Structure 1
Amino acid sequence: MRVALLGGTGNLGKGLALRLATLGHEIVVGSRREEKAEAKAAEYRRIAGDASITGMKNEDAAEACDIAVLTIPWEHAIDTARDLKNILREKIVVSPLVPVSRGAKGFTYSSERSAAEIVAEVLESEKVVSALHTIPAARFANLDEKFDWDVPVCGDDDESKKVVMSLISEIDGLRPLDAGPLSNSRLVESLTPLILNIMRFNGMGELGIKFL
């Protein structure tokens, strides 16, 4: 399928672009600046080898795709989603957004409502799927890295969720697990600050999670 990675010029965007493009999916890296998206798309094609990855401004990337992933810091992702609502309302939108803050006593979940539900509200869409919150970007983007991670996925539209889970499942080392309706997104997003605390208090590097 055609997958747009909005703000795909960054940390999580690189890993998704590399992993999905090598599986043959057509990737569009979106950026606030066309030249930056083009530059990153070129860098990603070079690393991946055989790959269809094109760069364009976010608005054009959103228009071109079937599925859009918001790989943007959450507070800004909400504004970008608002900007693009007439385009994105009709597409599958994946939210990997995590409202997390740091503090003297550790990392905390920083919102009273889940980021994914906030996005669904801004877009006035029933096709928001929440996923990818527990995939550490650096390890994910390292094509030499080996991992075995589970990816909880939430959402209210059965078809949209099925498409996203199927896509995630194609990536070797990832296993998507249905966590229910979008109202469970807070439980999924909360996994990230928990993981960051485990890393902090046990002196461990980047971690994902597995249910077993």
Structure 2
Amino acid sequence: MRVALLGGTGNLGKGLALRLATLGHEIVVGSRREEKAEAKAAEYRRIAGDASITGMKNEDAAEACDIAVLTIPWEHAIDTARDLKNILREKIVVSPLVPVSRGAKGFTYSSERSAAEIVAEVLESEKVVSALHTIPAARFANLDEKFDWDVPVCGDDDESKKVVMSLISEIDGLRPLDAGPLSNSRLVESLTPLILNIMRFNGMGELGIKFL
């Protein structure tokens, strides 16, 4: 399938582009500036080798995709979603977004509503799927690294959720787990500030989570 990584110029986008393209999916890296996206797409192809990774302006990436992943920072996510609303409203949109703040006492969940539900409202969409929030980006973007992580997935539409879970299952090392309706997204998103706190107070590097 075709997967657009909106703002996919960071490590999560890089990891998804490299791993999914190697599996045969057509990846489109999106960025505010087309030149930036094409440049990063070129970079990923060199690492990945002979695979389909192309770069486009976010609007064109969204237009061309089946699934759009919002790899943009939370701080600019609502504005980006709003601008792409008409295009994204009919696509499956995956939100790995988390409202988290750093503070003197550690990391906190900084919203009264979840990022995924806010995005669903801004998009007026029934196809938003919350997933991929707890994937250690640097480790994920390193193709020599092996891992065993679980990926909780939330969403109101059974079909969209099933498609996204199937896609995640194709990546060796990731196990998707259904966490229910989008109303449970706050519980999934909260794992990020919890993990950042564990990293901070125990002097540990990036971590994923496993339920067993």
Question: SS of the residue aligned with 1:20?
Answer: helix
TM superposition shift of 1:75: 2.5
TM superposition shift of 1:114: 0.1
TM superposition shift of 1:192: 0.4
Runs of 4+ in 1 over 4 A off after TM superposition: none
After superposition, give the CA deviation of every residue in 1:9-39 in whole Å (9 maximum; x if it has no partner).
Answer: 1221111101111111000000101111001
After superposition, give the CA deviation of every residue in 1:123-162 in whole Å (9 maximum; x if it has no partner).
Answer: 0000000000000110000000010000000000000000
Question: SS of the residue aligned with 1:153?
Answer: strand
The alignment-based identity, stated in percent, is: 100
TM superposition shift of 1:65: 0.3
Count how many residue pairs are aligned between Structure 1 and Structure 2.
212
TM superposition shift of 1:74: 1.1
Question: How far apart, CA to CA, are the structure 1 residues paired with 2:75 and 2:86?
Answer: 19
Equivalent position of 1:2 in the other structure: 2
TM-score, normalization by structure 1: 0.99
Question: How far apart, CA to CA, are the structure 2 residues paired with 1:36 and 1:120?
Answer: 27
Q: Within 5 Å, give how 1:1-212 maps onto structure 2.
A: 1-212=1-212
Question: SS of the residue aligned with 2:72?
Answer: coil
Question: How far apart, CA to CA, are the structure 2 residues paired with 1:19 and 1:198?
Answer: 27
Moved more, 11-20 or 91-100: 11-20
Question: How far apart, CA to CA, are the structure 2 residues paired with 1:129 and 1:143?
Answer: 26
After superposition, give the CA deviation of every residue in 1:144-187 in whole Å (9 maximum; x if it has no partner).
Answer: 00100000000000000000000000000000000000000000
Question: How far apart, CA to CA, are the structure 2 residues paired with 1:57 and 1:76?
Answer: 16
Question: How far apart, CA to CA, are the structure 2 residues paired with 1:180 and 1:56?
Answer: 33
Question: How far apart, CA to CA, are the structure 1 residues paired with 2:194 and 2:9?
Answer: 26
Question: How far apart, CA to CA, are the structure 1 residues paired with 2:149 and 2:50?
Answer: 25
